[PDB]
Subunit: 134 residues, 12 copies
Amino acid sequence: VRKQEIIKVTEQLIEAISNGDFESYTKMCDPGMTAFEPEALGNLVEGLDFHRFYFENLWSRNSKPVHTTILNPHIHLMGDESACIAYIRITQYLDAGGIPRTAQSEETRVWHRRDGKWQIVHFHRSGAPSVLPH
Amino acid sequence: VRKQEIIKVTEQLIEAISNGDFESYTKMCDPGMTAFEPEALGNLVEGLDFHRFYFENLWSRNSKPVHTTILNPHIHLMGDESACIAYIRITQYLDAGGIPRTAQSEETRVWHRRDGKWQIVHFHRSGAPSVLPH
Amino acid sequence: VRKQEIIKVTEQLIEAISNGDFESYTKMCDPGMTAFEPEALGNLVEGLDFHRFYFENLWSRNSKPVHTTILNPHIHLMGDESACIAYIRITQYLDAGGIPRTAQSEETRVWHRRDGKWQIVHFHRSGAPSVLPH
Amino acid sequence: VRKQEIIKVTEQLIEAISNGDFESYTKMCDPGMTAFEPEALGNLVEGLDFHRFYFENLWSRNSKPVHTTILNPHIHLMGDESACIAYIRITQYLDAGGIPRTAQSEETRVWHRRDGKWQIVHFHRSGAPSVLPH
Amino acid sequence: VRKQEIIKVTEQLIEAISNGDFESYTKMCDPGMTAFEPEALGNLVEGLDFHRFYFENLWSRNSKPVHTTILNPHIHLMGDESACIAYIRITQYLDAGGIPRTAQSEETRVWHRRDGKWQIVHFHRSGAPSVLPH
Amino acid sequence: VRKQEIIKVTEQLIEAISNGDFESYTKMCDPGMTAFEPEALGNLVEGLDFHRFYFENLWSRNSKPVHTTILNPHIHLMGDESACIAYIRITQYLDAGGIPRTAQSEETRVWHRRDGKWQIVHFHRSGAPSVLPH
Amino acid sequence: VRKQEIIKVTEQLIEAISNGDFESYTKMCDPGMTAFEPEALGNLVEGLDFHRFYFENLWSRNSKPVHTTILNPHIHLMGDESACIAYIRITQYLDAGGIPRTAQSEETRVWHRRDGKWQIVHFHRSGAPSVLPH
Amino acid sequence: VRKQEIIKVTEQLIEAISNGDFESYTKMCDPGMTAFEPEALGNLVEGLDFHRFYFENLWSRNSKPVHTTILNPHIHLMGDESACIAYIRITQYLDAGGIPRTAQSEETRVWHRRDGKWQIVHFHRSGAPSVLPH
Amino acid sequence: VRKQEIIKVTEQLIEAISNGDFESYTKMCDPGMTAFEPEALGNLVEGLDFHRFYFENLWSRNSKPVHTTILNPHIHLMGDESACIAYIRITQYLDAGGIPRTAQSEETRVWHRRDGKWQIVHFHRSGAPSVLPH
Amino acid sequence: VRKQEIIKVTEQLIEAISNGDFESYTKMCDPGMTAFEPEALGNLVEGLDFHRFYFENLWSRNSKPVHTTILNPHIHLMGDESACIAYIRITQYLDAGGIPRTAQSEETRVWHRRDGKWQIVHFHRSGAPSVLPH
Amino acid sequence: VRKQEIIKVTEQLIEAISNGDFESYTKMCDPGMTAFEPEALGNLVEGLDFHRFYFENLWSRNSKPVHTTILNPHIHLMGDESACIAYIRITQYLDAGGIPRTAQSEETRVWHRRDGKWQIVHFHRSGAPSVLPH
Amino acid sequence: VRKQEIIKVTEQLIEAISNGDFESYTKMCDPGMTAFEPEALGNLVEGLDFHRFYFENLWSRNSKPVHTTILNPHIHLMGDESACIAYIRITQYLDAGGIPRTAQSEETRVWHRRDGKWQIVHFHRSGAPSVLPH
């Protein structure tokens, strides 16, 4: 019951990221959120300004078929207020010439229940970049 | 006050890992702990059996000079029970020929206050492997 | 007689895959089927959703000449209900510029006779990816 | 109950392979067993003569620490006589200089219950070679 | 108060460089300014003639989206007349095909308060070149 | 006269670094000194603890012939309290086999006259690492 | 006299292959013919179905200038019924941009005089592939 | 019966080559024998002087374990006087450090029954060189 | 006074080379002039015929922006008749796609005052070729 | 006098080759002429048929500017009937994009005075291929 | 008869070179002899001083087994005084570890009958260097 | 007569450099001498201090056989006081394992007759470094 809620909210976040829906993304993310990801080049970025660039330039333009598979999710519940979820992500997309391609990443997300709703406080990503290479 | 406690416990964990003190490491880690790290080759490993190999074969034998610098730690407190810490780690070591070398990693750790003491539930590492290459 | 049936059903499966006939493919595959293949990047995928992407985007569009040769098939019969077949597959195709190309794979397939008809339960592929590279 | 038996026999086979115990290996393997593996260079080898070389020259000499982790096993039962098991394998070993190393493979095994005991009829391996590289 | 002034003037300089506004750039730079940068190929260039080429040919033509993030600025005040600022710079841009890309540089700038206004006397840059590669 | 003083103090600092004289180095460096250098891997390090490792392990052991040439020094004087010096540095050394080798770096140093004596507040280095590679 | 006949029939076969004349090729080849060639990827292919693909897609379309030189032919006559011929083959062709290119192969052919006419039973080719690369 | 004789004589030749028994090799080979092999660098060598070097320097000194597997032999009988045999060859050996290694070759051999005994007239080899690389 | 004359004549020569003005170039060069340059591939070329090709085909056609910086010129005067000048040359240009690029060369020129005017007798160039690569 | 004649005839041959004048080339070449050149791939070709391909396809079509420089010719006269000439050849040409390029070769030519006129009997070329690469 | 003499003298020269017999080599070579060879780096060397280094340092010390095969010699006779010979040379040797190795070269030699004995005037070599690489 | 003097003094300088005779080298070099060479990494070095390192560490220790060939020297005389010489230099040496090696450089030297003796004022070197690589 409690783990299904975390899985559901993570699925909502992933679907919002896929569609370039920056409004929903801003709604589910904490203002002070922190991130490790391949695009930051080893640095820790804070806030949502760093990620708005990719929504504006990549997600809000591209609409080609993309399929996402979430493998072996694991959830840690820390009281009734906070949770952590870690999983593997396989993304199938199409390159410039229209040839199917696949990429893999490992992702961790930390959720806090602020004022009655779940919000990401930190997230760490490894493996393939979010920007899909041809 | 509360962030200093997390910094202190993280420093204790790092120092215990450096010295190959598997007893302290087992004391600070949750039995169900999960890990993402370069050595797992993209897989999520559970338990402490995976890490005991490196204590037995690397940390419990090597004693050459190693210096660790922790850069830009950031801490999220989620109530009074749980916390998350993210930082950059620079490690200076000596290779096989005795030439100084440096490596960088990005690390996240999730702490839960179980039965009055902090314990790692999940951790995610990126960048250089823990096993120092020559 | 019994080995010829397995060879025939494997040929039907291969021909259905070649033509992008997802209906027949779904008919010959078990709902709980598992797969190892180069496209999964070392992971074990379950179900038919992972493979539907390539039918939608590769097999249901491309129609260029493709020739398939099956080398040294070997069949193990396990009672009257189950069988296993292992073979080498050589595929001749045309790249982007229209130059003939060849690729090789090694393939194993496990068939179970459910409710009177054969169905794949597991399959493992090595070598060249199914997505033909230029 | 029935899946635990397959897991147990697979663990016995893996432990026997680790120790270079060619007698047990010959006991659990069918005389007509077939194999796909990286060492065969894309060919299908039959019988146990191909594998005896590595028992004689690698397993029966080397005794350095090796740790094996089996990830996400999946089992298909085909009646009461036959079964198939597919899993990921992580192997931690020591190279020539004594530096810890890790390797990953994907493995499928087909078991038949002949005359009251389980025996491998076919097996397919992908990823790292069994011969551990430095 | 005094560090905020240096941060503000550095932001003005960066924004002027971004827009290809050579007039403002010439206004903020000392005539005898010196520079280390990747484009000089290990040499120390003096004056503003070396940099006018890139304003004429790159900044005064290109207008595609560019986002700049300044990480961990550190400021040294040397009396009331001079200051030094060192920081990391992350630049997000679009390559030839329109794919988002990121680059990192480390930058130091020395400011002198001449005749009541701040002016750059020397600057040293490392990492990615200013000319954004595809 | 005033530029000769800066050149002299820079020569003293370089000679002290060459001889592994950590006492003199600590004497000439400000406690809050900051540094960009290739060994930090793109990060800004503060304090003298990061550099003590190389004095302990490289400069305090090695004593092979090393020759240093300083090319085209340029000096900016900012009042009577602060100065900046930028130059090219050629280092001739011997590798592991005893073969002469040469390396080049570009270096900037910022000096502040605190309590009547010059002290480094910041320094930025590019090109070859200080640790001489074979 | 008898060696000239083998040379003549080999020349006829080569000319028929050059022109994409699959009818003549089928006439000169035994139904059970076997082949080693670079395109088979280390496998032994039997029959003429493997080679029909290249006649259909490469020889029956391309008509650009091609020049063939046969170097140092050697012939072994085994009775009055069978012969073997081994030679070097240099092929001059034009790539995609129209630039002359050259390739070399080593070729062996085994001829049997069945029902009064010579027919290839086996052939082995090394070196450059028949499919001419740009 | 007649194909078994060719298989037997080929096995004798391979075993004689393995043991460095140049006398038997000279006995089974025709004086005018011709050869294509990787060691000749694309040239056709005649006689047995080219191969005597490897018997003198490699086969007559090395005695480490070597295992040979012959895959998918195919035989063409041309009357009662001549035959041709084509097969794949897998060789397992030990490199300089004692690590097991495997190599693959494709081989064709032409036998003529002179004065009542079989003799090689021509042979063509592809793939791995006979000289085993570490 | 005398060094300024050499600097002036060298600037005239460089400007004439930049504009593809072969007449002025021929006027400033001795008929027996010799040259070392990267385009000669390690050979010493004599006369002006070798350089006329690049005037005809490169300088007399291209007119895109090019900026030249001369660094650290050094002049040796040998009596009143002859001089030598050595300097570093940085060239900023635009590649095929219009991206700014930079190149560096080291250049020596020997001037003789024949019949009252200066003329190049020999010149030696190292580093980047004169033909600007994209 | 006698060396000038050889130089003249060599210049005529080179100019005829440059213009794609196969008639003159055939006139100056002996029917039994032999050649070593990079295009033959290490083989010795006899006759003029091998070279006619490049006249037909390269020299008889291309007419872009090409400049040839002959460096350090050396001539050996063997009686009044035969001579040998060896020289270096620098060729300046234009690639596909119109960028000047240079290539170097070393060439030897053997001339025999048959029936009162000089004819090439053998020639050996090293270095760059005659077919000019972009 | 006349071609056999040239073959004999060439064999004598090759055998003398193999044994490091600089006296015989000097006896068979003309004082003004010229050479193209890979060791000269594209230059034409004159005299015997260049080759004496390799006799002193390589041929006069090494005595390991070396086997030479001469393939497809071709001879042009120019009157009764001069001749030219061109051939392929295969050399089998042993590297540093004692592993057999093979190399190929193409060679031309020009002989003049001075004062009643044959002498080399020019020679041109391509392919592998004479100095055998491991 | 006058060119022979320059050749003689250049030979003396080269022989002095070969023997590590720093006294003679200092005697023939001007105090203000300038140099371009590969070891300076694109910089112009002044004085003899830069070159003393290689005399101390390379020439004054190594004594293995080295042979030098000077190809195609060209000399320009500028009055009776100054001269310039340009040539190619081939150096034959022995690497670490004792294998002969060859290197090529292009060199220019400017001589001035000061107080009755010739002295180098400038020299420019291209190609192989003076420090001989294995």
